[model samples]
Target: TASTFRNFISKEPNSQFPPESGRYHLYVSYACPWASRCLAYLKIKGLEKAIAFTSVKPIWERTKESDEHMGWVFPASETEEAGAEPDTLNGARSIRELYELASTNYAGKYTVPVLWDKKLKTIVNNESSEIIRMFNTEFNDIAENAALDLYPSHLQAQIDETNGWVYDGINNGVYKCGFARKQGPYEEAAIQLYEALDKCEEILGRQRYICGNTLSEADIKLFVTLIRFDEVYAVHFKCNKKLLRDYPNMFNYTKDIFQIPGMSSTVNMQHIKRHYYGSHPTVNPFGIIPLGPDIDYSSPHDRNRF
Candidate 1:
């Protein structure tokens, strides 16, 4: 059932406590594009030092209690570059423990990209959309780039309008296709998914970012999904219509954003691959992770010449 989805959306943002450095924690999964959105925004806003981040290993076969499950784990060669931590705060092994610590009877699914307030000893926000909204503006005084506003007031109307459909049809559309139990539903979702992608590419062809010249929340929201289109969604979720590389604008648009100062490190293909193919047994019956997509996200993008 869609019970967890219903529960989190209704959970309100805790407002009694304001943003403070070393007091708030961000728990994220590199495997989840939604969680990646919050991570990217934190990096873009230059709040890396202001907020503490903990990443859950993307691969977990079962509910286990071990160092690998609980503490900060990173890809062997990339930990230093990626800034992954080792569960220093609570000393708890798995993310589930953190949720249990937040609420003893927490009935919701233990998900990542959770904003935890140490002072209040409760979750400040779990929904990625709301978490990024808070990241976009709430912590500016402490944010490194206090002037960078992803959600400008002038563009709020347009941002909201586009976000509404993109959220359901494209941003989350891949999940609908992958999770669909029937062929008809999967096909229906794939068609709508690409249509929304087409709509996005058309708009992107004229503007530098989703809203305008400056990057905004709408851009971050969509980037996390599109960035995974070829690497994860195309084969993993069976969203195989046309590769994102087929769309020149989108290909370059994603590269432009990825090349940003702190954005590249936020992406972990190793984690991304392991999480989808290894965790989702229903989608990949054999649970065999594929290794041959071989696309170079770091290659030179031509958006600068445009």
Candidate 2:
């Protein structure tokens, strides 16, 4: 069911949220790839001014040893370099509070990439895919890059198919490997994850982008995972079959996406690395972040040859 497609169209009778600038706010954690998807779209689509946003500090755990530890929270003080912005919109300390404001009895997990309605004082949606889709076309009436369509009509069919495997085998696959409880689960997830990566590598060997020449949201989806793979997942998650650099095509493809003009703002490697290592005590018990793998995102890529 498309039950979650609660579009933000103000004119629709079923909807209450409008399409006006400054009426909606985004809540994200820069370290979260799902949330990062919306952040990337907000920048590349040039809707930065259209909808305001704030990010939580990367390491969001209750290591203070408090029973009521908040999950994702705004920085106690602003540290612009880490991308953790203060929650000035509603002044809510934690992402969970925003959910509470939106629903009467919200007991679910407090997740990132919340699309909040300023006028209505409610949450429009929390699903990342829906948020990015809305960003693609919904706010174009006010978007700076109005004509830039990541999911063009011609590529929808291909993009749609690509998304299914990419999401299952790659985007969510990394988590499956990382959070696995035992050897069997890790083995299954790692095998399927590598299989999907190989599939993507093959696709890139022929075309510049995963779904062809024109970069779609599909690329953004893959980019977040690929960027985080070597730095976090490969070691922490036991997805050590191969590092991203081991895959020639995918490695170059990652640099290609990184080189995009507005993408730099979306990727905060400092947050991404620290969050993964420190936040999960069960994984890296000592919370020791690595200083190696010295990969430069801005390094030249041969993707231009295609």
Candidate 3:
């Protein structure tokens, strides 16, 4: 079974790793929605220059039967073939190597969106949710767009309330449907997934953003999942009850966010599709990636009318 490392970075002055520009770095994967959230925040908050990053290959290094081999690897060189950026910090070949450097006896999953403290030579946190929160405020003094607050104190309660259901019903619910080994559990998860989408459709129907007029962390959290629903999760995850296009409000909401300046850079649809289709051997036995179903996120959206 897979478990998470729950350590976090504190902004407190006495904290071991206080916020500092160029001192912390991020290791992420374009294929991972959780990792994408942090990347999007970095751009939206204008912290791209403040924080450095490295991207893993779209596909894991594993055989068709199993991933017993090296998992996620950095590109051999500065080549664009795998879309991987070399690990400049440690010169490690794989993500597992970084995890080992953090802890000698570590046996948990080597997940992305890892916040690495260069001074301490350890991982600050691997949880995407917590990492984004730190990025939202920790480096405000050095952040280019510090005025943009995705988690304003005024709406913390509303944001927290919406996040709870979204995380369980949609963000992770898709996984529940895709990874289920049995029909009973798969159908149950699909039902919950659509039900949550229905609620979101109704909510977006009246407001421009998830919480209201202004964007918040809640919207970023949901966008990562919504952006991937049509391309990967719909068919690959067996969540085919309705395509994302079927919901006008939800679809437009997604487009609105996608059109935000610099947001599109964080998305790599090729990587997303490749990882989902080519990585899951059990899901796609032949590893045949599907084509077509061309989408147009660049089209103008009417969400501004709200």
**Against the unseen true structure, what C-alpha lDDT does each candidate score?**
0.79, 0.86, 0.87
Q: CA shift at 93, candidate 3, in angstroms?
A: 0.9
Candidate with better TM-score, 1 vs 3: 3
Q: After superposition, how far is residue 68 of candidate 1 from its true place, in Å?
A: 17
lDDT-based ranking: 3, 2, 1
Cα lDDT of model 1 by residue, 160-254, tens digit: 99899899888989989888889999999999999999998898899778788888889888889988888789888889898898988988999
Estimate the overall C-alpha local distance difference test score of candidate 1: 0.79
Please give, for residues 130-248, the per-residue lDDT of candidate 3 as tens digits. 98998888888989999999999999999999999999989999999999999999999999999999999999998999999999999999999999998899989989999899999
TM-score of each: 0.88, 0.93, 0.95
Higher lDDT: candidate 1 or 2?
A: 2
Residue-by-residue lDDT tens digits, candidate 2, 1-306: 222324554535556776789888899988999999999999999999999889888887552354756488776667643588778888887787677767756655788888988887888888888889888987889999999999899999988999999999999999999999998988899999999999998999999999888899899999999999988998888889999999999999999998899897888888899889988887888999988496998999999998
Q: Where does candidate 3 have its weakest 10-residue lDDT segment? A: 62-71
Global fold similarity of model 2 (TM-score) = 0.93
Q: What is the lDDT of residue 170 in candidate 3?
A: 96
lDDT of 2 at 45: 95
